[PDB]
Design an enzyme around this catalytic site. Structure first.
Site, PDB file in Angstrom:
ATOM      1  N   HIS A  45       1.385  -2.164  -9.391  1.00  0.00           N
ATOM      2  CA  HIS A  45       0.982  -3.483  -8.872  1.00  0.00           C
ATOM      3  C   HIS A  45      -0.416  -3.886  -9.373  1.00  0.00           C
ATOM      4  CE1 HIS A  45       3.647  -2.978  -5.061  1.00  0.00           C
ATOM      5  NE2 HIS A  45       3.759  -1.849  -5.735  1.00  0.00           N
ATOM      6  N   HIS A  88     -10.629  -7.342  -5.164  1.00  0.00           N
ATOM      7  CA  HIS A  88     -10.475  -7.105  -3.723  1.00  0.00           C
ATOM      8  C   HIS A  88     -10.969  -5.734  -3.329  1.00  0.00           C
ATOM      9  CE1 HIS A  88      -6.907 -10.147  -3.602  1.00  0.00           C
ATOM     10  NE2 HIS A  88      -8.081 -10.748  -3.668  1.00  0.00           N
ATOM     11  N   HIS A 143      -6.624  -8.479  -9.444  1.00  0.00           N
ATOM     12  CA  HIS A 143      -5.495  -9.347  -9.733  1.00  0.00           C
ATOM     13  C   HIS A 143      -5.876 -10.163 -10.960  1.00  0.00           C
ATOM     14  CE1 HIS A 143      -3.484  -8.428  -5.860  1.00  0.00           C
ATOM     15  NE2 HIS A 143      -4.722  -8.326  -5.411  1.00  0.00           N
ATOM     16  N   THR A 202      -1.423  -9.355   0.601  1.00  0.00           N
ATOM     17  CA  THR A 202      -0.720 -10.206  -0.368  1.00  0.00           C
ATOM     18  C   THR A 202       0.419  -9.483  -1.066  1.00  0.00           C
ATOM     19  OG1 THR A 202      -2.234  -9.797  -2.259  1.00  0.00           O
ATOM     20  CG2 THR A 202      -2.794 -11.554  -0.722  1.00  0.00           C
TER      21      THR A 202
HETATM   22  N1  V14 Z   1      -4.174  -8.082  -2.079  1.00  0.00           N
HETATM   23  S1  V14 Z   1      -4.155  -6.897  -0.953  1.00  0.00           S
HETATM   24  O1  V14 Z   1      -5.532  -6.574  -0.725  1.00  0.00           O
HETATM   25  O2  V14 Z   1      -3.419  -7.384   0.180  1.00  0.00           O
HETATM   26  C1  V14 Z   1      -3.602  -5.506  -1.577  1.00  0.00           C
HETATM   27  C2  V14 Z   1      -2.909  -5.479  -2.879  1.00  0.00           C
HETATM   28  F1  V14 Z   1      -2.667  -6.605  -3.505  1.00  0.00           F
HETATM   29  C3  V14 Z   1      -2.481  -4.244  -3.546  1.00  0.00           C
HETATM   30  F2  V14 Z   1      -1.862  -4.366  -4.714  1.00  0.00           F
HETATM   31  C4  V14 Z   1      -2.714  -2.917  -2.939  1.00  0.00           C
HETATM   32  S2  V14 Z   1      -2.254  -1.551  -3.714  1.00  0.00           S
HETATM   33  O3  V14 Z   1      -3.195  -1.383  -4.802  1.00  0.00           O
HETATM   34  O4  V14 Z   1      -2.373  -0.404  -2.862  1.00  0.00           O
HETATM   35  C5  V14 Z   1      -0.706  -1.562  -4.331  1.00  0.00           C
HETATM   36  C6  V14 Z   1       0.291  -2.127  -3.332  1.00  0.00           C
HETATM   37  O5  V14 Z   1       0.075  -1.458  -2.096  1.00  0.00           O
HETATM   38  C7  V14 Z   1      -3.456  -2.885  -1.636  1.00  0.00           C
HETATM   39  N2  V14 Z   1      -3.540  -1.613  -1.152  1.00  0.00           N
HETATM   40  C8  V14 Z   1      -3.635  -1.133   0.202  1.00  0.00           C
HETATM   41  C9  V14 Z   1      -5.072  -1.048   0.661  1.00  0.00           C
HETATM   42  C10 V14 Z   1      -5.200  -0.084   1.839  1.00  0.00           C
HETATM   43  C11 V14 Z   1      -4.897  -0.815   3.148  1.00  0.00           C
HETATM   44  C12 V14 Z   1      -3.560  -0.433   3.744  1.00  0.00           C
HETATM   45  C13 V14 Z   1      -2.385  -1.322   3.424  1.00  0.00           C
HETATM   46  C14 V14 Z   1      -1.870  -1.127   2.018  1.00  0.00           C
HETATM   47  C15 V14 Z   1      -2.700  -1.968   1.071  1.00  0.00           C
HETATM   48  C16 V14 Z   1      -3.875  -4.183  -0.957  1.00  0.00           C
HETATM   49  F3  V14 Z   1      -4.514  -4.233   0.205  1.00  0.00           F
HETATM   50 ZN    ZN Z   2      -5.434  -7.609  -3.607  1.00  0.00          ZN
END
Ligand code: V14
Ligand code: ZN
Ligand code: V14
Ligand code: ZN
Lengths: 243, 251
Positions: free
Chosen positions: A52, A103, A80, A184
């Protein structure tokens, strides 16, 4: 997305279009406080392509406050971005999409675990900054971008030296927009406090190309355009820390 | 624990020694105007007479436990369920509101305590940001008997003893609050009794509620607390804002 996770069809999702003229100025929104972000070179940090985004895991000790007694610890950061000149920020400003967006995800110090925080108001807080094209190579970002070829394959990872995480963020910590929304990506949990810096950071065109052209995702796809569509505010008012 | 006597409240709960406690002195000149603060919205507060509710002298206040289905919103996405209400009051010729406005203490104060819909139980919400929300309104003297308040106040004699309770018919709970839901102050603070947990969103209405002199005297002169003392002056001292900024939904 609602098919695989119904939470993504909630009323209060992110990202959103920011319209500064419609933002509510509150003088109660004080400058962001970010302490412990100046990491030494050792210990090294895990940088990972997760399909992602590229994620950088952050150590304990990065303390952040959105206000008096509203404290947070940074967990990770990720980015992103778009593809081949096309912009890939998640948030937009008056319909303008920026080249990319960083982010930094934080956990409230009232919650010991992320899984308790998910879906709870203020449990998670994300600092978001737009990345724009500028004339000079960005030193802070080069430390990460120069390590991306190593993790080009989906699921691969490497270790990078500690760096000043605060150097990846804009100049003025007193100027930002703030609202409550969601993650997101799935699980699209609500109750996330989003803080979007007013000012941007600049990376060179080559740096931006490096961000958007090095990593591969799931299947044989390039890891590109990894942004969600803009979501309706549904009555939420975006606040601003400046008149 | 009890008002004006040991045990210090920190020895009961360390949170009572926190930096960001309630109540506070509201100085409206130093309040920050914020137009994101929309009118509060209440759903389910107009109750049928049955089932009855339980009105209790708990030794610190008179509380009315609220039934399930009373929904309150501070805004889009900021949803809460009402748990209970209680009062704070003074004594003959002495005001007893918790909050003050520019140093002025009002005769009495009503608090309606709510739980965020993200939490199933109070104990998971305590100390979490926005986990609990309280609606607060000042009670002042007006010329008329307040009919909604009379339903409760006419039953205080039945519960004069500490730890006693009685059943009362449901009523319009929103009739114990001001009609003006647009104009209010809002800040983050604490419970004002142990455990004094922080993260509580306090909303204090601009408009006051009117009770008769007789009603105010009934409230302060009927109930007994811990020992053989009258339940009076049951308000905590105002706490320093300590850098917090009170918000106002009007300039
Ligand atoms: N935009 S976002 O901040 O809502 C977001 C992402 F877009 C994203 F791609 C990720 S990722 O790198 O981990 C891949 C998909 O999970 C996280 N990561 C996590 C940050 C830790 C908080 C717990 C919830 C999972 C999100 C994440 F938080
Ligand atoms: Zn993000
Ligand atoms: N002022 S206050 O809102 O912080 C407060 C009281 F002053 C108070 F007296 C009470 S009480 O009547 O119930 C006496 C016991 O403290 C509650 N009640 C509780 C509301 C339930 C949710 C929060 C836990 C304990 C306080 C209460 F929340
Ligand atoms: Zn109270």
């Amino acid at each position: 997305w609602p098919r695989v996770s119904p939470a993504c069809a909630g009323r209060f999702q992110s990202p959103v279009d920011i319209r500064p003229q419609l933002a509510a100025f509150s003088p109660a929104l004080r400058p962001l406080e970010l302490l412990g972000f100046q990491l030494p070179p050792l210990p090294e940090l895990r940088l990972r392509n997760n399909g992602h985004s590229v994620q950088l895991t952050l150590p304990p000790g990065l303390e952040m406050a959105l206000g008096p007694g509203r404290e947070y610890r940074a967990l990770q950061l990720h980015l992103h971005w778009g593809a081949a000149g096309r912009p890939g920020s998640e948030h937009t400003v008056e319909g303008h999409r920026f080249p990319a967006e960083i982010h930094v995800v934080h956990l409230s110090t009232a919650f010991a675990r992320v899984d308790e925080a998910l879906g709870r108001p203020g449990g998670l807080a994300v600092l978001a900054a737009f990345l724009e094209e500028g004339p000079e190579e960005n030193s802070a970002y080069e430390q990460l971008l120069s390590r991306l070829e190593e993790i080009a394959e989906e699921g691969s990872e490497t270790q990078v030296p500690g760096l000043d995480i605060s150097a990846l963020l804009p100049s003025d910590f007193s100027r930002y927009f703030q609202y409550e929304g969601s993650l997101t990506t799935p699980p699209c949990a609500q109750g996330v406090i989003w803080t979007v810096f007013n000012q941007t950071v600049m990376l060179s065109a080559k740096q931006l190309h490096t961000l958007s052209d090095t990593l591969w995702g799931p299947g044989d796809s390039r890891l590109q355009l990894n942004f969600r569509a803009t979501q309706p505010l549904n009555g939420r008012v975006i606040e601003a820390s400046f008149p």
